């Protein structure tokens, strides 16, 4: 079973988006008004699930094949790959990376999405994989389209892929969104702008990666993920 | 000062989180193995319990698109981190609110006591992380049990909450669902009876 | 008795810290949500106590001697001195300056401080004095240490000394904190950063003052205090 | 425009304010002369009164580490600035909330009427400045008396508060405590019944 | 026994302090006036002691516990940690790091120190440790205070910790001093300024390291040490 | 050109070096194991010798706060880097000058011959590094022996000193101290008879 | 840090200093009142003495254009600062070396003992400031007396000179000039027997 053998660098909650960001309208009623209560790290916070023994299907990371209903999905074929490291630069191996997204037209395969853009009969929009022993992950997918949403009267999400990363503990677990290099919708989005620091926003923008492309086949984007720094305990209880 | 690489910033999971993390609930086919809300096989050691709850916004309305992750010790106070659908017990699970009733459920065992880093026993608890549309960075909380009053009163984590009235927001209420032992843990994100949320 | 013959320059409440500064967590539930009600200055506001005839003990300003229990306190011996003036540059003579602080290790001599750093048996941490006829005050003390506090999960106050200054009226009375030149904790502190304007923060940083040091004995810091400008009434009720 | 030297910015007094300004309360030895909560000796002219109160935060909880400074006229409506412990009366005093019960007290005389700058009589009042952990710049208020209702109705300062309901927050309630006239003045920093605070 | 199989990069004696730096008064009569005689590296210079099997006491690195006379020392609790590498960036594992310092008030526990600030009965001021397999060392201590000394008529050392590092050979052995980020005494000190190049001075300034702090307990400073680069011999005697 | 990371710059050891590196001398308790001035136990092979010396500044005055580190071959001309207090012989040691008389001592064996990198034999020598208040970067020297005159005359390191008169400064003088062979090696940091110091 | 106005920087007095400060010596007419080398009227209290000396450069050659200012207590240990040619005693005086012999002279009384700021008695001394061509900022020294050995050995200023040999440079030698009590105080600016110079 798990042991308490490490500590995680405290989060910078001015680097992360704050809870109350009123231009993103749903945050107004879904943000705590009381301060968070700080607690010391214990075994409860410094451990978490490892997914090495979860059974992955052969196409779990390949969205071009994992919802196959007689053909290929329509859209810009892309590899999305990168490395998960911690804040000390140490790779995070054998960690769970999950992702979900709309199709090439900005339509989600979810019963609550009523956008008029059609579903793609060969696209589901969900992937998962475990990082390798050096911290690398990769998915194959199509580039999602922007999509309009009922925030302001003419608001559109930039093209984006949702990510969840487990990391070594529940203290490291993160959900975020990947955006694409150069997309002019990025500076306009109130969800992007929930992040106050422009440098933090830049950390969410995947870069075109021609080195990783398959010629005559698919392009590639690179998105590296940094989880909280992990260190050994020192000088505790003395 | 020493500045490390900055952590990747959080974003909301959004209202379609279920596509990626709760496939059934999205209305979609599941894969062979899924991480879900049954932590204990029927013969896992300990007292088998149902946990359930609803999530409220600052207007007192149900948050029908909540996604929750839980982490708890087994009945012997051990954290089982080697996740496997074949395990008798997994310390990790996921759940989500139904869109109709707004109610989540988890099938588990009552966790055993674990010590904090100073060696002081913590009262039995489940660690919870809450994600949803409108929530930019997930909210951490703990579910404790109303039939552990003696332990709760001495818990070094509950004692870090300055006001006793606020400690009460983390105490789940023992009840019965279809005749079976259950505890209800409602979360109020904002306002009257606002649930304590943690940073660590 | 006191008379209504002066007016005090209106406070800039964007130069001062605002009431609600959520990163300083205790401010959330202890800040008014309604606007302050402005009222004209009357004799109630433009007068205040004069402490010329308060009886001071011989060591009241000298924290190296005013908690003597058989020895000298441990820590960096310093003089803290400066001038109290008003916004027009006029000295504020015979005014009460009070101060309190932690010991060299960041421990306060207060029942509610349970920080693990030890008390110093020869340090109490409280001083007071009256400014002289030219507006100058002086204390001798030990430089206080930083100290951790339950705000965020790893927050530390910079080394600081708390100050209270009466001035000529209850309108000028001020409580503040002195910080020390170059302290890398200053930019990180949510209490410091309750002040929005970086130039205002600089006004709280005491400067090393080698000119005022006693060689082979103690260093010195200089901290000048500016109270609201005082003027005569003019053209009122006509 | 003309820009003067900027005023030194305020900071919170913090939770250990007592060690500098309320020595007893910190758990500490006092000096020969201390500025404290007895404004009037038995022999001062005027009606001798006890003032008491509790301070509440926005969640309705006691602020147990409040520090208060008060400034009031003598029974003649004159402010006495020459502070001296030998005086039968001083216009200035200090008090603090008990950490246990959260109550402060003051022993004084009821102040006489003073005119505003325009020559209009103000109802009898005590000027209060409130400091504490969490308060970045002290809050100014006035304590008026419920046995002065006719005067209060005409006070030009109370009449600057636009809503009559908010004026009620400044009116202390008369009682009898061990056979002496007393008034309770509770302060609510935030929320329901929030006390009016002034800028001047 | 040791072998001659490495060479060490020649020292830059304009990066180091020169011998004669007259503002540091004791250097005047203790500096050679003749040039140093250069000699080629032989086994005498390129070897040195390895202290892997020196016996360390359990508290040798922990100045909060290694002079325990009934309590904790008074002062700012800190970890001082860092890595020893060579000029090529290679870690220097299992190397001896020794340190000594004054107490919180600038008083040394040495018969020849008569500064009036008191000794601390629970502080001795000496530490040692061996770097780990990856070149890292750690001490726990109290931040030392500045202290006055008989150089000029009002000279004060900045807060500092003395360090000695063995390295792989007697050619790499180094004694230096650590100073603390932001200390306004640093630019004023004639011992600091024995180093002519301001960039070299910056290499001695330890940085506040909040990532390595123990919340509610102790702060941390980071101080990395660079020893002479080590290379294999090549093309010698041919 | 290729620029590596710069080396950490040296600073003086200062006058309290003893507290860190010569514990006894500071007036302080020692730890269980200390690195000190006895390189050889009675049972080490070779000729057992006492070394002693005083250190002078440029005005001819004793340096009473010197700290010295020494490194020498064993009697076979081999360097022993595995430092252990259990060893009959260690190649490394430390000593310091008495504050009173200014003399340091070392107990060791006479080192054997070692070749330079070019295979030419060096005369027997002890490598010395000298630290003190006033010395910003330690001074390197060698102690050779006056009973090795023929070897010294051919030493390729001594022959790098251009002037024969300066070579004499590195030659320790043999004496007898309580019936044991000893050598005096005095160091003059500056001026008349200035000791040769090396860079390497 | 706090930076005051910088002091006006020193420059050499140059070789024609006598024009301004030693008019006779320049070869020029004097004014009615001049500040010169007779500190004591013949009937001033105390032991009347002649002081004289020569000043040497680092080559052992006379500095024939020296200008000296002196400041000393009177015989009762009092500093007489109200300079007046009518005073029995002036604590201040000036002198200069003759260009031929290089010798300065001063006519005074032996100073009484004064305490340092800690209340410790200083041995009888004259404070001297030396100016000349080649001297960019004047040199401070003190002249003590060889017949005050007991006092000199205990002087808290002489004891700040680390080496006893250097203390000897400040001790003037009792002698007789034309049969009268005198003390000779030679100053060596540089080199062998270099006079101690002070900063304060
Ligand atoms: Fe989305
Ligand atoms: Fe404080
Ligand atoms: Fe030092
Ligand atoms: Fe000239």
Curated annotation (Swiss-Prot), chains A, C, E:
In its UniProt record, a GO molecular function of this protein is: ferric iron binding
Q: By its UniProt entry, which CDD domains does this protein fall under? A: 3_4-PCD_beta (cd03464)
Iron: is it a keyword of this entry?
yes
Q: Would you kindly state one Gene Ontology biological process term found in this protein's UniProt entry? A: 3,4-dihydroxybenzoate catabolic process
Q: Which family does it belong to?
A: Belongs to the intradiol ring-cleavage dioxygenase family.
Q: Which cofactor does it need?
A: Fe(3+)
**Protein EC:** 1.13.11.3
Q: In UniProt terms, what function does this protein have?
A: Plays an essential role in the utilization of numerous aromatic and hydroaromatic compounds via the beta-ketoadipate pathway.
Question: InterPro entries in the record, alphabetically?
Answer: Intradiol_dOase_C, Intradiol_dOase_core, Intradiol_RC_Dioxygenase, PCDO_beta_N, Protocat_dOase_b
Q: What class of enzyme is it?
A: oxidoreductase
Keywords tagged on the record: Aromatic hydrocarbons catabolism, Dioxygenase, Iron, Metal-binding, Oxidoreductase
What quaternary arrangement does the UniProt entry report? The enzyme is an oligomer of 12 copies of the alpha and beta chains.
Q: Specify the pathway.
A: Aromatic compound metabolism; beta-ketoadipate pathway; 3-carboxy-cis,cis-muconate from 3,4-dihydroxybenzoate: step 1/1
Q: Which PANTHER family match?
A: DIOXYGENASE, PUTATIVE (AFU_ORTHOLOGUE AFUA_2G02910)-RELATED (PTHR33711), INTRADIOL RING-CLEAVAGE DIOXYGENASES DOMAIN-CONTAINING PROTEIN (PTHR33711:SF10)
Q: How is the cofactor bound?
A: Binds Fe(3+) ion per subunit.
Cell division is among the record's keywords: no
Q: What is this protein called?
A: Protocatechuate 3,4-dioxygenase beta chain
Q: Which reaction does it catalyse?
A: 3,4-dihydroxybenzoate + O2 = 3-carboxy-cis,cis-muconate + 2 H(+)
Residue positions annotated to bind Fe cation are: 108, 147, 160, 162
The record's Pfam families line, in alphabetical order, gives: Dioxygenase_C, PCDO_beta_N
Swiss-Prot record, chains B, D, F, G:
Reaction catalyzed: 3,4-dihydroxybenzoate + O2 = 3-carboxy-cis,cis-muconate + 2 H(+)
Q: Which Gene3D superfamilies match?
A: Aromatic compound dioxygenase
> Which InterPro entries does this one have?
Intradiol_dOase_C, Intradiol_dOase_core, Intradiol_RC_Dioxygenase, Protocat_dOase_a
List the GO molecular function terms: ferric iron binding; protocatechuate 3,4-dioxygenase activity
- Could you say which enzyme class this protein belongs to? oxidoreductase
Q: Name one Pfam family in it.
A: Dioxygenase_C
**According to its UniProt record, in which pathway does this protein act?**
Aromatic compound metabolism; beta-ketoadipate pathway; 3-carboxy-cis,cis-muconate from 3,4-dihydroxybenzoate: step 1/1
Similarity section: Belongs to the intradiol ring-cleavage dioxygenase family.
Name the positions where 3,4-dihydroxybenzoate binds. 133
Q: Which cofactor does it need?
A: Fe(3+)
Q: Does the keyword Protein transport apply?
A: no
Quaternary form? The enzyme is an oligomer of 12 copies of the alpha and beta chains.
Record key words, sorted: Aromatic hydrocarbons catabolism, Dioxygenase, Iron, Oxidoreductase
Q: Any binding details for the cofactor?
A: Binds Fe(3+) ion per subunit.
Q: What does this protein do?
A: Plays an essential role in the utilization of numerous aromatic and hydroaromatic compounds via the beta-ketoadipate pathway.
Q: Which protein, by its recorded name, is this? A: Protocatechuate 3,4-dioxygenase alpha chain
- The record's EC number reads 1.13.11.3
Q: SUPFAM superfamilies, alphabetically? A: Aromatic compound dioxygenase
What the entry lists under CDD domains is as follows:
3_4-PCD_alpha
